[PDB]
Amino acid sequence: AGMFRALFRQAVEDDRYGEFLDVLAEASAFRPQFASPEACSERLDPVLLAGGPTDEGRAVLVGCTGTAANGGPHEFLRLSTSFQEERDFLAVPLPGYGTGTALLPADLDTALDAQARAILRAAGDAPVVLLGHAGGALLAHELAFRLERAHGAPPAGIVLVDPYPPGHQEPIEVWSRQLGEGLFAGELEPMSDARLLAMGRYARFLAGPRPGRSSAPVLLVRASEPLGDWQEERGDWRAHWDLPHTVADVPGDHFTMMRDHAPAVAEAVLSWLDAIE
Amino acid sequence: AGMFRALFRQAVEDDRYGEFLDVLAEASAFRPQFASPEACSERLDPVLLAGGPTDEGRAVLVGCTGTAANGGPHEFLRLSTSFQEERDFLAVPLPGYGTGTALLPADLDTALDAQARAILRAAGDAPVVLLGHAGGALLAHELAFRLERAHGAPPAGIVLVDPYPPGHQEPIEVWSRQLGEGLFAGELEPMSDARLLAMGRYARFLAGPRPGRSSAPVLLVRASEPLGDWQEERGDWRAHWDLPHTVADVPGDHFTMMRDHAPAVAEAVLSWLDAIE
Ligand SMILES: *C(=O)[C@H](C)C(=O)[C@H](C)[C@@H](O)[C@@H](C)C[C@@H](C)C(=O)CC[C@@H](C)[C@H](O)CC
Ligand SMILES: *C(=O)[C@H](C)C(=O)[C@H](C)[C@@H](O)[C@@H](C)C[C@@H](C)C(=O)CC[C@@H](C)[C@H](O)CC
């Protein structure tokens, strides 16, 4: 395919993943942007992947698609089949990755706003619980804070699947070789350069300083296996959130917890969603 | 073409030529390299573009290909024809702009040594005179110093057509916009991204500290007309070299001196080559 993918592949071989996300981020600024929510090119309509039972005031899960360039609609397919007959599971797309190619959000809040406007429409009046894995975790918490403040529609709760927020990213950096290798592994097609740029831009948004904590109760799903090597001498490699309302450990590592062991993740979510209603 | 050419074109409209030329250099670190002169992918065999008289002590012109990604072999055609029946004129390619796609020099000295080898092997016993325009004048001098210091075989002279060496590029900044637009306006087809990466890598090299100065006599050929506006009380917009053997001015600006008035340039070089013989 494109040259940005050839550079990306070379940077993973050569254990320079970190360096190269900076080039992706810096190059993304010369893509076309959209500056206001309605100026988004993609129809951000959510997509129903599971239905709940025909009852009544229960909450719907909203999956927030992650930053991975090789991500798309299929991200939540394995996970969602375990919410069938349990909860509505809608997956919202992320602005910057669709069909030509798409306008990049000028800044993070513009994209979160465009997302919240589409979730509110499709949610109706159901209470809404947000869900993200990895970079999607960070994203979901920001959308939860952006729904609370900017739109006065605070979510019923947030599920964070293995988040490494800016305080606690040391195990993510150490393992960045595997993270990069995992992106390539999990490829249905050659990653487009348009999406690699999109990925780099959101990587920059989320790396940055971010102020508010969202008042919604947080469920923190952590992996059990480390992604790579890690001397016990060096501390806890597990994902971290500050005052989890509930902590749940599922089998596998940063990657396999949503592939092989996604039913354990849905089991934690179901148990938790009832304990809060 | 590809994504880099799109990003670059966006950047020129937004007077951000400078910042994007630094994305290109950063990005180019992740291309495959060659670290010794032998490991060069291309055959750097020079090319005969003008034949001299059949008369020996007689010096040959060697043209050093510039850094512009929009060029290659056609660069010296208008100039070389005025050397027919006057001087032999070789044109030596720059490593990194070949066929698939070509390996990049680990550093500038690895490229010059690759080129100095193909030039000694072709000059045979003749004195060589290196000739370069814009970025290629910075490359001509750097090669002359390499042929001297490292190969023990200094050239007979250097023809620097309009250099703006590191401490005197204020005109190059003020005119960044015109420069980037002329880069596109000279496309005879889309600029490949591997070549755009090539340009940014060499541009980085040439901004470096290259303290070695050559001992060959230097003909500084200057444009007569400024490329864009310039407030005369800023200093001199003209091209600059320290202590040149000869200064010759020619009609046109930084671009047009080499297209429209390549006859003027060639006559300056022929008069001077005689004076030093
Ligand atoms: C999760 O996606 C990664 C490990 C993550 O949370 C880091 C710390 C964030 O900065 C994101 C924005 C990193 C980017 C580069 C990313 O998209 C990583 C994607 C990989 C690691 C996914 O696990 C693939 C399913
Ligand atoms: C000459 O090539 C340019 C104006 C130049 O010398 C600048 C000051 C150097 O930094 C070079 C290495 C800059 C690169 C980007 C370059 O080759 C630009 C080339 C265009 C604008 C040429 O004028 C076309 C031959």
Domain ranges of chain B: 3-275
Residue B131 near residue B62, CB atoms below 8 Å: yes
Beta strands in chain A (DSSP E): 33-34, 47-50, 60-64, 89-92, 104-105, 128-133, 157-161, 218-222, 246-249
Q: How far is the CA of B183 from the centre of ligand 2 (A)?
A: 9
Cβ neighbours of B3 in A, within 8 Å:
2-4, 193-194, 197
Q: Which of A118, A202, A109 is nearest to A153 (CA)?
A: A118
Q: After which residues is chain B broken (C to N over 2.5 A)?
A: 55, 99
Question: Please, which residues bridge with residue B64 across strands?
Answer: B92
Q: Which residue has the least CA distance to atom 24 on ligand 2?
A: B68
**Ligand 2 mean position to B206 CA, how many Å?**
10
Copy the structure tokens of residue A258: 């949503």
Question: A3-228+237-275, which class in CATH?
Answer: alpha beta
**Spatial contact of A235 and A226, defined as CB atoms under 8 Å apart:** no
B194 CA from centroid of ligand 1 (Å): 28
How determined? Answer: X-ray
| Residue of B75, B164, B179, B227 best suited for mutating to test ligand 2, as the one with most atoms within 8 Å of CB | B179
* Cβ–Cβ under 8 Å, residues B140 and B130: yes
Judged by CB atoms closer than 8 Å, whether chains meet at B26 and A23 is answered as: yes
Q: How near does any CA of chain B get to the CA of A25, in Å?
A: 10
| CA dihedral sign of residues B233, B235, B239, B245 | positive
Tokens at A262, concatenated: 């996604």
Q: Mapping DSSP to helix (H, G, I), strand (E, B) and coil, where does residue A54 land?
A: coil
For chain A, list residues whose CB is within 8 angstroms of any CB belonging to chain B: 2-4, 7-8, 10-11, 14, 16, 19-20, 22-23, 26-27, 30-32, 193-194, 197
Rounded Cα–Cα distance for residues A17 and A11 (Å): 5
- State both tokens at A260: 């092989």
Q: Taking CB atoms and an 8 Å limit, are B3 and A194 in contact across chains?
A: yes
Q: How far is A113 from chain B (nearest CA, A)?
A: 26
> Which value in Å is the resolution of this experimental model?
2.8
The crossing angle, in degrees rounded to 10, of helices A3-13 and A17-28 is 160
Task: Compute the count of residue pairs across chains A and B with CB atoms less than 8 Å apart.
Answer: 48
What tokens were used for B7?
A: 């990003």
Contacts of A2 in chain B (CB under 8 A): 2-3
* Residue A97 near residue A198 (C-beta atoms within 8 A): yes
Most B CBs within 10 Å: which of A4, A8, A20, A30, as the mutation test of the B interface? A30
- Compute the 3-state secondary structure of chain B and give helix, strand, coil in percent, each to the nearest 5: 40, 15, 45
Q: What are the Cα distances from residue B246, in Å, to A66, B198, B220, B222, B271?
A: 63, 32, 6, 11, 11
Atom of ligand 1 nearest to the CA of A199: 17
User: What's the CATH number for B3-275?
Assistant: 3.40.50.1820
